[PDB]
Amino acid sequence: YKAAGRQTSADAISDTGVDLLIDQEKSIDFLVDDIDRVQVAGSLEAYTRAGATAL
């Protein structure tokens, strides 16, 4: 202020910014063959849990 005489004049305010993009689209897609569902020794439900864990 002392170097500017004793003068002050107002400045214009300004902003920065960044973008968060919802740009990831990922999928799980698989077959439970219904011949295999009959022939296997027990339940195949575990592959649905493995798919959720993989995502």
Add this chain to the structure above:
Amino acid sequence: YKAAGRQTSADAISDTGVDLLIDQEKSIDFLVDDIDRVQVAGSLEAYTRAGATAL
């Protein structure tokens, strides 16, 4: 799913496995002479416990 256009096609599920073999067959086989069983200073039962402990 985004690099694939917006397409998805199903996979075959697949498994892993291991087999446990009941292939070990071990024995103990011994004689107690029935002159000795009488002539010795005490019980010979300890030889049965030795045999069980060895298996």
